[PDB]
Amino acid sequence: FWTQLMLLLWKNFMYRRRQPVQLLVELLWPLFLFFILVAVRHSHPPLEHHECHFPNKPLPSAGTVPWLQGLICNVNNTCFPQLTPGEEPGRLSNFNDSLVSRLLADARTVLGGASAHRTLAGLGKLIATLRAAQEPLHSLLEAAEDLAQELLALRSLVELRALLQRPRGTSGPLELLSEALCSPACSELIGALDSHPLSRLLWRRLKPLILGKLLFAPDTPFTRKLMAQVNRTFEELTLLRDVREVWEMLGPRIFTFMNDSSNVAMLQRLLEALRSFLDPGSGGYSWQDAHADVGHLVGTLGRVTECLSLDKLEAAPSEAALVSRALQLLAEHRFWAGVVFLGPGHVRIKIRMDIDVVTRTNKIRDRFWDPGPAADPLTDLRYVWGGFVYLQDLVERAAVRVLSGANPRAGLYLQQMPYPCYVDDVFLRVLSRSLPLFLTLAWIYSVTLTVKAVVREKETRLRDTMRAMGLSRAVLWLGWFLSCLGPFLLSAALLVLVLKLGDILPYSHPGVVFLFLAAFAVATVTQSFLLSAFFSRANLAAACGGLAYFSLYLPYVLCVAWRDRLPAGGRVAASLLSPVAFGFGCESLALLEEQGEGAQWHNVGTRPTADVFSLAQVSGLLLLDAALYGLATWYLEAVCPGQYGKVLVEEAPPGLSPGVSVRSLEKRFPGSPQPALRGLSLDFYQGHITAFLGHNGAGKTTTLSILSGLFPPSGGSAFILGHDVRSSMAAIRPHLGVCPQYNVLFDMLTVDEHVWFYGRLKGLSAAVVGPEQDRLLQDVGLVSKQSVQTRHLSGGMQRKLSVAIAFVGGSQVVILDQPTAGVDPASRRGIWELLLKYREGRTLILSTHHLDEAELLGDRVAVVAGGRLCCCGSPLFLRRHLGSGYYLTLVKAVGTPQLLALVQHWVPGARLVEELPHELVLVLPYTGAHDGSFATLFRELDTRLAELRLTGYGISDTSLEEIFLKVVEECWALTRQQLQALLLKRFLLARRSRRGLFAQIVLPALFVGLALVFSLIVPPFGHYPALRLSPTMYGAQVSFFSEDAPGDPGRARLLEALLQEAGLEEPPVQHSSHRFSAPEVPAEVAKVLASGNWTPESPSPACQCSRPGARRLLPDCPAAAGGPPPPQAVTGSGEVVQNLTGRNLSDFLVKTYPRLVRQGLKTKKWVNEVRYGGFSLGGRDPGLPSGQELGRSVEELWALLSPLPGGALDRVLKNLTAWAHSLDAQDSLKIWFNNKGWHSMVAFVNRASNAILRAHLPPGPARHAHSITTLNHPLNLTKEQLSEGALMASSVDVLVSICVVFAMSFVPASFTLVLIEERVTRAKHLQLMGGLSPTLYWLGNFLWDMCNYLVPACIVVLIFLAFQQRAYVAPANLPALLLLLLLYGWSITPLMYPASFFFSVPSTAYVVLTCINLFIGINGSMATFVLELFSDQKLQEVSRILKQVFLIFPHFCLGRGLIDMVRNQAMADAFERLGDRQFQSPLRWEVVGKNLLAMVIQGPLFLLFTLLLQHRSQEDVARERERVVQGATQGDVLVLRNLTKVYRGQRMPAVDRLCLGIPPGECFGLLGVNGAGKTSTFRMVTGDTLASRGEAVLAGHSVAREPSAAHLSMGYCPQSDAIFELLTGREHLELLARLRGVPEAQVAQTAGSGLARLGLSWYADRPAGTYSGGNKRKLATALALVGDPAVVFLDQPTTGMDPSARRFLWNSLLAVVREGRSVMLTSHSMEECEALCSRLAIMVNGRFRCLGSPQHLKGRFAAGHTLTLRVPAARSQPAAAFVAAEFPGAELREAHGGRLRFQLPPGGRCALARVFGELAVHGAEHGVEDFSVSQTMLEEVFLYFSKD
């Protein structure tokens, strides 16, 4: 266990050690990704803030001066870390320091006491007038003294005198106003405002207020009453203009009584008074200064008040005319707002202002929650500077004034709810949506090398060998898991260090987050294992693994999008995937970081919030997912049960040793109906090599599997060395070795540690492996190839290293399986010598499928058929029981009956079978096997052979082939039909692969439709809806009404009305005493409150803010902060009201704010706050009014000082009566708004006004018959907002525009993968053989390309019609889409062909092509659309001009044409309400026609591109060479001359200047080893690559003359299975028949003859997948010879098939040679050449060595006469003594205990009779079993091939 585990770990580590660049890019890809992430983090630093309070903003219902005050001063809306005085419960105004309020209070405090001092003057004037028609003089002197000293004791007048006696230069008028606050004259004022940017922006908040309009649409007298009440703040605002002309009748007039008129003034002023009156001089200024300054100030105020409207109120009786007039006034910038009295009693009010002026009204809250008060007056405040709530409250007060019948003096003070000190970091807000994507993209590569490696080791079937040879699958999975956890954990450690040290996750102990990432790694590596168990294809699974991994992350996106909707149980159930369980854990980590405390060991086991996981509750879930994936892999490994994805016998050797004795196995595949094998009872012997012949998979693999360690023996007895598989299975393994049919090698390993690996696993120790290793590496002969340390660089030789691995243990039993299939003949003798070296003392089971080596290697031979044993034994006469015993061949370079008679006088048993020219074959039967009779026959035959005119003889014994065959049965128009053949063949290829076409057609065409039909979640841009205004649209919430100075009945009435409007039913008093229900106070917190010095007006104790070094979002404090829980009550509408009377009211809200947000803080998408707005029924402003005596004084001046009958002075005085009497402001109100809720301000303003209406109303049906509900609905559009609502939103159109490219990219790649597997499989070769020009082949197949592109275009067009889409249903834009799609498909096909000629695997080509096409699609659509919209400057416009003219990508113009047509539809839809005149034909040539022109002109270029790259191709040795050079043979079909190969890169010619001539009537048997240039020689006669140098003509026709003429009479047969798996045998025959122009009457006859010549009646409609290799090779040969070729090409047609199929194969091709057709052969098993043909040729390293007729070469260097013997005593020397005494040759080979072979000197003219009768006594001389003379067969040369 523990040895092989560490050995497998070493084996897996050596893979990555040998492949370093994959490991290096593995280590440096997520480092680059997370360096990008840390650059993003460093680009956006965290930002903190202090506790934020906000100043009071008065509304014009509170008077006029505070409204200006708040507008001019509080324009910036600056924050305040200290408390503003406007939030204290007592004060309402916060401008004691202001000069204007100081002036108001000073006037009210010095004019209050001057009541008697002016009535005294009045009565004195009255009595002086009475006496005319000296007490008052001195009395008024003292009164004037008192008044002058009262006036002069004021510091504010000196301040305004110094401020007003200042120049009009650098600052301007607005700064002069704000210093004391905090017509061409109008043109100069506007120029002064525009002179400074500060005054410019302050006028930008004021020019709609000054030059705006109020346009009320209905004109009933109710609306006229409304407007005549709301203009009372407008028409009476400019009343100072009136007092201006008061100076114009009083200023100069008294001036005319002043200058040169001191006589009337000296008398009263003379009779400390005169120094107080300031009698004028050089220094005393009292009269001229006063007149000049008063005139200057009144002129300044008049010129400031020159260009107000004086009637901004206008009218319009039509709402459409209202919209048009508003548009015009916007065009000249003179519009403010439109009141609409759209009624049905109650009053409904619409406000219509511009979009720049009003907040958007589509949604209520935000969509991504920013954690601040959000008070920036430019961005989200629009109800203040824009001028909504001013108007709003003005019309509200007018409506309540006209509906109440009274005049409520209830102002409004808007006030922002203060915010605690926050920290705004966007990065830490989105880390829950970023890090689970960035880790998955970091490990989308690192999974695709685990699936790739595991499937690759499941594909070469070496894992089956390791499982059979001693391993357990548990050890395999343990080794793979422990080896793949390496890179995952290393990358996890690196990407934990990066997160901690890059400030991405600060405050966090890296141990817990590293444990978290290890819990993700251990849950994704087994995810990769489960993904790998699906497949059996290496590159296909490697490509599909990343897609299937990243397609499981998208549930996390789908869950984070709709987090609030689903409950916890569904979250747990959907957390059973690997990345989603990491996603929720990362959300919990980010939200735990969010409260400042990084992940540490204190808080692992606690949920940070009530609806998220914990770190411990996730790290236990990933392990559960890992266990589930492992269990599912364990279950799914059983999807492949077992598999992947007559008594004529003798058992009596002299050496008996049943080391592997087996009896009667029965096995049964579940899918076979017959048993896997039948019973057999034979046993094997060590010292023998028992050959095991059979059929293709019908016994040549299953028996050797069941006697190995793989298959279990449920049936049969298989005792190996006494014990069976079912019991021991442990000690046999050191004595057992195996070698299956496939290679058992490691691809990236080398040889020395390979044999060390197998030896160390087999049980050999490390101290004894080396002495095995050196002799193993030298027995194979790889000492030269072990120090170079190469594995993949040697090919075909590796079969030797497949069999030497079976000898690493010195095992007594070795089981081979077809060890001679894929090996060159130069190493066949090498492996045979290896087995002969290792044949002594070992039980060799060599189940070769060939019959040309069992006679050499096999001491005994067993033959099985279908699982049934036919016969077994030594290959001598004891098993050679055939009637035709021996075959005599008398050869010529005369007369059958004379020689037949001669045999008949000698031996009458005879048989004449063959009487062909130059060879006569007789049959001597074994019946009468008297060697003396044969000797006495051959004596006369020797004396007759010289004069018989033959001069040649050769007599074979019975071969193993015929006894095997005996025992096997006991157990223009021509081009048009080329197009027809091409289209029908492609049709049958397509029509069978059902699910592949189903995927590659149905997924994109329905994917576009599904994406468009479910991508309507994007909001439709356009008009903005009207919105009802109330706090009831926010749902359930809280509010408060904290009142101050409640000593009034009116304030109680207003409070009761506010409560009744708050959804609270007014209860009876016995239940209204406890109407509220105070909640429980925590007693352990109540003791903290009592311990502290707390009263309900004292501040809350503390709240821990963001420490330096530990930053939080919202400060942490328990219930001690925020005071006690205030009393509360519940309403019927779900609102809560909280009596907050007598608190700090800002040390409460700031402290209590975060605990309300903590419920909705979980996802931060749509955070339902609960505290949106409150109230405060504020009482009296603290300060003495003294306005009662001011009203008395102003009425006394009205009735005393010149009462004008016209009322010019009198109406000013009467307005001053209200200015002084209503200056008390007997009640006031605040409105505490929130700004995260967009509409809280004006909704609570409307609520306050409704409360005022309810308060000032008598009972009855009028309290509910009087209500007013304001609305908010902006204008339709203006000129630039036509484009804004039509073109710069554009999300749905661009998403479908990218989506059609996204989906239509995957359709034509199905062509590319099919044509690249047509490339790498050599089918393209065999359709290039014929009349098919490659240009003709291409023009055959793009017609099919358009034919199959006709499929998805109809589906997408009809599904675009079916959705009733506005841009695809009308008959003007539908044909544009149709033509664009059709020409786009015309243009996308020809550009993807030449990637196949650069690529290898269809899966790799698929994924690379779709990656590059997807990338260019997203680039050329989105980047271009983003460049051309939201423009910046001229450089981008110049860049996009070139980007939209060059247009070289087809997807670029598809996307741009579709976007252009859909924006034409959008602009027409926007135009249809305005003055359109819009025909808008989408088929314009300058709009979309350039795209179709570019497609129709660029398509042929790529059509010819793949053609132009494809058509770049534009003694007997001397006795043949000199004959061909000196003369060309026209009778010979094939003439080759200068067969020289210029290899690119190898720098060496293959064959050195040799020429050939091939006669047509015979077959030419060519043989070539690797490196002798065979495939190239087939290749240029084929004509694949360049035809530059070398003459090669066939049938008198030149390849250089016509290339297609060289393919008509050339029938190729590759070793590659160049057949379609979805099309059966008769259909290849039919397809080739129509490819050769066979007439339709002869097509069926040709197909039937082609199938039935080589069987195929049962294999007719059977698919090509369910064939054998022999069946596929034999139908390839039949396809090669069908079509009438002059020469038939067979390149390696024989690789291990059943020799019965060989019998019919060379029977059929011998018949076709007798028909007169030449045939080309080249293969590794050269017995076929001597079995069928009549001419042999060999070349090694491209040099001809024989090049002659095979019998002449046999007379030259072969054709010796040999002998095989059989002796029981194994005493070879006594036999060899007389045998070498009889014959002069005394060689010896295979002097072994089985048998003995002997070779005599070749070419003996004397017959072999001199031994035969000699044997007839000499075989009786010693103990001899049997003899078989192996003299002059054709097969003797293979022994030559076994020698040298």
User: Could you give the CA distance from residue 482 to residue 474 in angstroms, rounded to a whole number?
Assistant: 12
User: Could you give the CA distance from residue 532 to residue 1175 in angstroms, rounded to a whole number?
Assistant: 66
Q: Are 51 and 81 in contact (CB under 8 A)?
A: yes
Q: Is 700 annotated as a binding residue?
A: yes
Q: What is the CA radius of gyration of the chain?
A: 54
Given the structure tokens 């954690």, which residue do they identify?
Answer: 371
Q: Is 1573 annotated as a binding residue?
A: yes
Report the candidate in 1021, 893, 885 with the shortest Cα–Cα distance to residue 951: 893
Give the E-state strand segments of 1545-1599 in sequence order.
1556-1558, 1564-1568, 1591-1594, 1597-1598
Half-sphere exposure of 65 (CA within 13 A, CB side): 15
Q: Give the pair of three-digit tokens for residue 1410.
A: 């779709």
Q: Is 1569 annotated as a binding residue?
A: yes
Report the candidate in 1043, 1034, 1268 with the shortest Cα–Cα distance to residue 1134: 1034
Show Cβ contacts of residue 217 under 8 Å, excluding neighbours closer than 6 positions. 316, 317, 318, 319, 322, 338, 339, 340, 341, 342
User: Could you give the CA distance from residue 1388 to residue 1392 in angstroms, rounded to a whole number?
Assistant: 8
User: Could you give the CA distance from residue 1566 to residue 1573 in angstroms, rounded to a whole number?
Assistant: 12
Q: Are 277 and 144 in contact (CB under 8 A)?
A: yes
CA dihedral 94, 100, 106, 109 (to 10 degrees): -60
Widest pairwise Cα distance in the chain: 199
Q: Are 23 and 16 in contact (CB under 8 A)?
A: yes
Between CA 1104 and CA 1111, with CA 1105 as vertex, the angle to 5 degrees is: 120
First and final CA of the chain: distance in angstroms? 47
Phi, psi of 1540 (to 5 degrees): -115, 135
User: Could you give the CA distance from residue 85 to residue 63 in angstroms, rounded to a whole number?
Assistant: 19
Report the candidate in 537, 546, 531 with the shortest Cα–Cα distance to residue 458: 537
Q: Running DSSP on this structure, what letter comes out for residue 231?
A: G
Q: Give the pair of three-digit tokens for residue 115.
A: 């009541």
CB neighbourhood size of 1672 (10 A) = 18
Q: Give the pair of three-digit tokens for residue 1332.
A: 């098919």
Segments in 502-620 forming alpha helices (H): 510-532, 538-550, 554-561, 568-573, 578-594, 615-619
689 to 85, 657, 816, 855, 1668: CA distances (angstroms): 111, 13, 10, 11, 27
User: Could you give the CA distance from residue 1316 to residue 1313 in angstroms, rounded to a whole number?
Assistant: 5
Report the candidate in 849, 525, 509 with the shortest Cα–Cα distance to residue 704: 849
User: Could you give the CA distance from residue 369 to residue 1160 in angstroms, rounded to a whole number?
Assistant: 10
Show Cβ contacts of residue 1194 under 8 Å, excluding neighbours closer than 6 positions. 1213, 1216, 1217, 1220
Helices vs strands, H then E, count in the chain: 71, 37
Helix (H, G, I), strand (E, B) or coil at 1748: strand
CA dihedral 886, 892, 894, 899 (to 10 degrees): -10
Q: Are 730 and 470 in contact (CB under 8 A)?
A: no
User: Could you give the CA distance from residue 715 to residue 663 in angstroms, rounded to a whole number?
Assistant: 10
Segments in 562-701 forming alpha helices (H): 568-573, 578-594, 615-619, 621-636
Report the candidate in 234, 207, 219 with the shortest Cα–Cα distance to residue 339: 219
User: Could you give the CA distance from residue 1689 to residue 1325 in angstroms, rounded to a whole number?
Assistant: 12
Angle between helices 239-256 and 1208-1221 (to 10 degrees): 120
How much helix, strand and coil, in percent to the nearest 5, is found in the chain?
A: 50, 10, 40
Give one word for 365, left, alpha or beta, with left for phi > 0 and alpha for psi -120 to 50.
beta
User: Could you give the CA distance from residue 1238 to residue 374 in angstroms, rounded to a whole number?
Assistant: 10
Q: Is 696 annotated as a binding residue?
A: yes
Q: Give the pair of three-digit tokens for residue 745.
A: 């090698």
Q: Running DSSP on this structure, what letter comes out for residue 637?
A: G
Q: Give the pair of three-digit tokens for residue 1719.
A: 């045939």
Q: Give the pair of three-digit tokens for residue 1291.
A: 């999300």
Cα 1767 vs. chain centroid, distance in angstroms? 76
Helix (H, G, I), strand (E, B) or coil at 1765: strand
For residue 1624, which amino acid is it?
T
Given the structure tokens 């994917």, which residue do they identify?
Answer: 1007
Q: Is 1571 annotated as a binding residue?
A: yes
Checking DSSP bridges between strand 423-424 and strand 47-48, what pairing results, if any? Answer: antiparallel
Sign of the CA dihedral with 1687 first, then 1689, 1690, and 1692 last: positive
883-957 architecture in CATH?
2-Layer Sandwich (3.30)
User: Could you give the CA distance from residue 38 to residue 438 in angstroms, rounded to a whole number?
Assistant: 12
User: Could you give the CA distance from residue 987 to residue 991 in angstroms, rounded to a whole number?
Assistant: 6
Q: Give the pair of three-digit tokens for residue 823.
A: 């090996």
Angle between helices 770-779 and 752-762 (to 10 degrees): 130
Q: Give the pair of three-digit tokens for residue 1120.
A: 């001690």
User: Could you give the CA distance from residue 392 to residue 52 in angstroms, rounded to a whole number?
Assistant: 27
Q: Are 1038 and 1138 in contact (CB under 8 A)?
A: yes
CB neighbourhood size of 37 (10 A) = 22
Residues of the chain within CATH 3.40.50.300 domain(s) are 689-873, 1516-1543+1572-1730
User: Could you give the CA distance from residue 161 to residue 103 in angstroms, rounded to a whole number?
Assistant: 12
What is the layout of strands, in order, in the sheet containing 1136-1138? 1038-1040, 1136-1138, 1128-1130
Report the candidate in 1462, 1465, 1461 with the shortest Cα–Cα distance to residue 1483: 1461
Report the candidate in 818, 824, 756 with the shortest Cα–Cα distance to residue 795: 824
Resolution in Å, one decimal place: 3.9
Angle between helices 1669-1681 and 1640-1652 (to 10 degrees): 140
Q: Is 129 annotated as a binding residue?
A: no
User: Could you give the CA distance from residue 435 to residue 582 in angstroms, rounded to a whole number?
Assistant: 10
Cα 557 vs. chain centroid, distance in angstroms? 13
Phi, psi of 1437 (to 5 degrees): -70, -40
User: Could you give the CA distance from residue 531 to residue 525 in angstroms, rounded to a whole number?
Assistant: 10
Phi, psi of 652 (to 5 degrees): -160, 85
Tally the residues of the chain.
1844
CB neighbourhood size of 1825 (10 A) = 16
CA dihedral 337, 342, 343, 348 (to 10 degrees): -40
Q: Is 502 annotated as a binding residue?
A: no
Give the E-state strand segments of 247-299 in sequence order.
none
Topology, domain 1516-1543+1572-1730: Rossmann fold (3.40.50)
Sign of the CA dihedral with 1499 first, then 1500, 1501, and 1503 last: positive
Report the candidate in 1681, 1594, 1578, 1669 with the shortest Cα–Cα distance to residue 1633: 1681
User: Could you give the CA distance from residue 1542 to residue 1534 in angstroms, rounded to a whole number?
Assistant: 21
Q: What is the DSSP string of 1773-1830?
A: HHHHHHHHHHSS----B---SS-EEEE--S--SS-THHHHHHHHHHTTTS---EEE--
Q: What is the DSSP string of 416-430?
A: EPPB---EE-SHHHH
Q: Is 699 annotated as a binding residue?
A: yes
Half-sphere exposure of 866 (CA within 13 A, CB side): 10
Residues of the chain within CATH 3.30.70 domain(s) are 883-957
CB neighbourhood size of 1617 (10 A) = 17
User: Could you give the CA distance from residue 1632 to residue 1651 in angstroms, rounded to a whole number?
Assistant: 12
Given the structure tokens 């290792």, which residue do they identify?
Answer: 838
Q: Are 1835 and 852 in contact (CB under 8 A)?
A: yes
User: Could you give the CA distance from residue 814 to residue 846 in angstroms, rounded to a whole number?
Assistant: 9
Give one word for 306, left, alpha or beta, with left for phi > 0 and alpha for psi -120 to 50.
alpha
Show Cβ contacts of residue 1128 under 8 Å, excluding neighbours closer than 6 positions. 1038, 1076, 1077, 1078, 1079, 1136, 1137, 1138, 1139
CA dihedral 1272, 1278, 1280, 1281 (to 10 degrees): 40
User: Could you give the CA distance from residue 98 to residue 1238 in angstroms, rounded to a whole number?
Assistant: 32
Phi, psi of 693 (to 5 degrees): -95, 150
Checking DSSP bridges between strand 919-924 and strand 911-916, what pairing results, if any? Answer: antiparallel
Q: Is 694 annotated as a binding residue?
A: yes
Experimental method reported for this structure: cryo-EM
User: Could you give the CA distance from residue 1454 to residue 1706 in angstroms, rounded to a whole number?
Assistant: 59
Q: Is 1527 annotated as a binding residue?
A: no
Q: What is the DSSP string of 356-419?
A: TTS---S-SS-SS--SS----TTTT--SSSSSSHHHHHHHHHHHHHHHHSS---B--EEEEPPB
Q: Is 1273 annotated as a binding residue?
A: no
What class does CATH assign to 689-873?
alpha beta
User: Could you give the CA distance from residue 1287 to residue 134 in angstroms, rounded to a whole number?
Assistant: 89
Q: Give the pair of three-digit tokens for residue 242.
A: 């009136």
Bridge partners for 340 per DSSP = 350
Report the candidate in 107, 216, 201, 224 with the shortest Cα–Cα distance to residue 154: 107
Between CA 1049 and CA 1057, with CA 1052 as vertex, the angle to 5 degrees is: 125
Show Cβ contacts of residue 898 under 8 Å, excluding neighbours closer than 6 positions. none
Report the candidate in 1508, 1521, 1687, 1533 with the shortest Cα–Cα distance to residue 1611: 1687
For residue 1347, which amino acid is it?
C
Q: Is 1568 annotated as a binding residue?
A: yes
Bridge partners for 1130 per DSSP = 1136
Q: Are 856 and 825 in contact (CB under 8 A)?
A: no
Half-sphere exposure of 1204 (CA within 13 A, CB side): 11
Quick one: which H or E segment has residue 870?
strand 868-873
Show Cβ contacts of residue 833 under 8 Å, excluding neighbours closer than 6 positions. none
Report the candidate in 1102, 1138, 1105, 1104 with the shortest Cα–Cα distance to residue 1123: 1102
Give one word for 912, left, alpha or beta, with left for phi > 0 and alpha for psi -120 to 50.
beta
User: Could you give the CA distance from residue 416 to residue 373 in angstroms, rounded to a whole number?
Assistant: 9
User: Could you give the CA distance from residue 193 to residue 413 in angstroms, rounded to a whole number?
Assistant: 28
